[PDB]
Amino acid sequence: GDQRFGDLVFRQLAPNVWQHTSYLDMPGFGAVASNGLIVRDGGRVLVVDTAWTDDQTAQILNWIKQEINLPVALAVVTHAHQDKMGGMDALHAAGIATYANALSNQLAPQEGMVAAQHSLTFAANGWVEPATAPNFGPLKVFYPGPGHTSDNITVGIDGTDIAFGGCLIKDSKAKSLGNLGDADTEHYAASARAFGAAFPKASMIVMSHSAPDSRAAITHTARMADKLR
């Protein structure tokens, strides 16, 4: 099920959806896997999250060229940390239109990231303002509230059973909520639950640092976050 491609791993999750995985050896954490998504929509490819680095992100684009061979119409990144946004320059070098939460773009320089070219804004109920996410096809972008970070966003894939929680969601057996350095501890549980409520049909939950899981990832993440209050 896993395809090794250079130093990256790709896993098909649905007829039109693949998970990309890249690794960074970070001092104190080991070699951390980070996951994003690749979605074919008709004659276009859409990407969710970069790899950790520009070089790894260029390798994602190389895999897409070899395995799908359709243009990458856009990428959306899910917050301003390196696992999600470290490869922005590779997307720009490739001519790909890039999107992030407006707040992610504002935070990018101080986080050591390069901003995306376009900013998403969100209605009070969390759904993206559609004018700011043109041509997103089946990608349904939802801001669940502050959690792992204040700017974290999530993405469902219409027509599939898949939703992507990024670094907000940890797997159903996780022992901790990971890196809480920029987290909103009081609102985390509610934000995890809001993600689940936004995508009630999603039976496959994809996340940054573990393999795809059932919705027990959502309930378990929220239950762990209940203890932060």
Q: From 105, 106, 93, 29, select the one nearest 61 (Cα to Cα).
A: 93
Instruction: Report residue 59 as tokens.
Output: 């390798």
Instruction: Report residue 111 as tokens.
Output: 């986080």
- Given a contact cutoff of 8 angstroms between Cβ atoms, the answer to whether 188 and 225 are in contact is yes
Residue 106 as a binder of ligand QNA (CB under 6 A): the answer is no
- Given a contact cutoff of 8 angstroms between Cβ atoms, the answer to whether 38 and 16 are in contact is no
Residue 83 as a binder of ligand QNA (CB under 6 A): the answer is yes
Residue 193 as a binder of ligand QNA (CB under 6 A): the answer is no
Residue 220 as a binder of ligand QNA (CB under 6 A): the answer is no
Q: From 78, 101, 74, 52, select the one nearest 165 (Cα to Cα).
A: 78
Instruction: Report residue 76 as tokens.
Output: 């959306």
Residue 49 as a binder of Zn ion (CB under 5 A): the answer is no
Binding ligand QNA (rule: CB under 6 A), the pick from 82, 106, 185, 214 is: 82
Binding ligand QNA (rule: CB under 6 A), the pick from 19, 57, 150, 208 is: 208
Nearer to Zn ion, 16 or 101 (CB): 101
Q: Which residues bind Zn ion (CB under 5 A)?
A: 81, 83, 167, 208
Which residues are near ligand QNA by CB under 6 A? Answer: 29, 32, 81-83, 148, 167, 178-179, 208-209
